[PDB]
Amino acid sequence: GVKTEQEDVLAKELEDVNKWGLHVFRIAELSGNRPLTVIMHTIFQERDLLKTFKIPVDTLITYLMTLEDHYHADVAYHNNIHAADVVQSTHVLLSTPALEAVFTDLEILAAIFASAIHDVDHPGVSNQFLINTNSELALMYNDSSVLENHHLAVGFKLLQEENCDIFQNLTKKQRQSLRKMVIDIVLATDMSKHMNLLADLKTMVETKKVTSSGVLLLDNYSDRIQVLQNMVHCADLSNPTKPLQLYRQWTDRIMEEFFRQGDRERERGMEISPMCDKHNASVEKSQVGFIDYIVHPLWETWADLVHPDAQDILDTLEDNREWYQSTI
Ligand SMILES: CCOC(=O)c1c(NC(=O)Cc2cccs2)sc2c1CCN(C(=O)OCC)C2
Numbered sequence: 001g002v003k004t005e006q007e008d009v010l011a012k013e014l015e016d017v018n019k020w021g022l023h024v025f026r027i028a029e030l031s032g033n034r035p036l037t038v039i040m041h042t043i044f045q046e047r048d049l050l051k052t053f054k055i056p057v058d059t060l061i062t063y064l065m066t067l068e069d070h071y072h073a074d075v076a077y078h079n080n081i082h083a084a085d086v087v088q089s090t091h092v093l094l095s096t097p098a099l100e101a102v103f104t105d106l107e108i109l110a111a112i113f114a115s116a117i118h119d120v121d122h123p124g125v126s127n128q129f130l131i132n133t134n135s136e137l138a139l140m141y142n143d144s145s146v147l148e149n150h151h152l153a154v155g156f157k158l159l160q161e162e163n164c165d166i167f168q169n170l171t172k173k174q175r176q177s178l179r180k181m182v183i184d185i186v187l188a189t190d191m192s193k194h195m196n197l198l199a200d201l202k203t204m205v206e207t208k209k210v211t212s213s214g215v216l217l218l219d220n221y222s223d224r225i226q227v228l229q230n231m232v233h234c235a236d237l238s239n240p241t242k243p244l245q246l247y248r249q250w251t252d253r254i255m256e257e258f259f260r261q262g263d264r265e266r267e268r269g270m271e272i273s274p275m276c277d278k279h280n281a282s283v284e285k286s287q288v289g290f291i292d293y294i295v296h297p298l299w300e301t302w303a304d305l306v307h308p309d310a311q312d313i314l315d316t317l318e319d320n321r322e323w324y325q326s327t328i
């Protein structure tokens with residue numbers, strides 16, 4: 001009735017779940033490549049989500065396992081480890097003091113469940129690739145947020161497998177609210193929605209409102225869901241805000257993917273995508289490009305919304321940013 005030494009080493013690593021920069025890769029290793037399941041389960045236990053939502057634990061694990069097994073292990077970046085990381089990062093963002101007691105349990109469950117499934121069954125190529133190659137997925141979803149529609153459809157479809165309906169006890173109301181929210185969040189993970197997401201977020205910041213003991217005031221779905229979308233979006237692009245040790249493995253993995261994608265593009269006639277070009281790609285320039293133009297403005301804006309909560313995070317990102325500049 002006692003944990004194995006591995007289960008234990010694994011538990012201690014998990015003692016870090018509330019902290020930015022958990023070593024998710026070790027956990028991936030320690031758990032036999034179940035980082036998504038153990039972290040999810042840890043988070044679910046930790047937030048008491050099973051009781052609150054009457055989620056049977058065996059059902060929770062079955063779904064978790066099923067879900068994790070639908071990420072591709074043969075995909076360098078968009079796999080269950082990335083899933084797990086985004087989950088845990090979202091987890092941590094939700095705990096930010098500026099948000100204390102702001103969101104309901106259902107909104108938390110949505111944010112976390114969204115993060116868990118937001119890339120599920122990712123082929124490791126981009127929307128544009130899928131579109132240009134005339135792939136089933138692209139045709140299924142009429143070229144619009146192809147991947148993200150697919151992650152959702154799969155994440156929800158997996159609830160129907162044997163003993164997988166983790167939401168079997170929620171009322172229709174809870175379920176419809178959860179579903180809509182989860183959909184709005186995962187749809188907002190599409191990079192082409194970035195600029196708009198940020199705009200709104202800056203606007204939230206600009207037309208800011210706080211209330212009692214100083215935590216964001218949000219008295220409508222549009223505002224609530226926008227913060228959640230930006231939150232999970234931030235987690236999705238949180239890698240450059242992690243300790244360089246983490247950041248670099250993530251860059252390795254993303255670059256492996258882009259290069260592999262550029263490999264399929266180069267042969268299949270297509271002109272090697274942006275930054276995907278093998279040998280002709282500067283990873284260090286691309287990381288500065290990405291940080292300066294996309295990642296920093298997102299996190300700076302997010303940091304404002306939650307000032308001073310995200311300061312260490314934003315600082316890490318700037319350190320990491322300058323670092324890559326060393327590599328020039
Ligand atoms: C060469 C740098 O590329 C990326 O890192 C990178 C992403 N990676 C991440 O999910 C976060 C990370 C930061 C560092 C390692 S992983 S998402 C993305 C890019 C290129 C520009 N994009 C974009 O604007 O549109 C694509 C649809 C989408």
Ligand SMILES: [Zn+2]
Pocket residue numbers: 118119147189190
């Ligand atoms: Zn995605």
Ligand SMILES: [Zn+2]
Pocket residue numbers: 082086118119189236
């Ligand atoms: Zn992602």
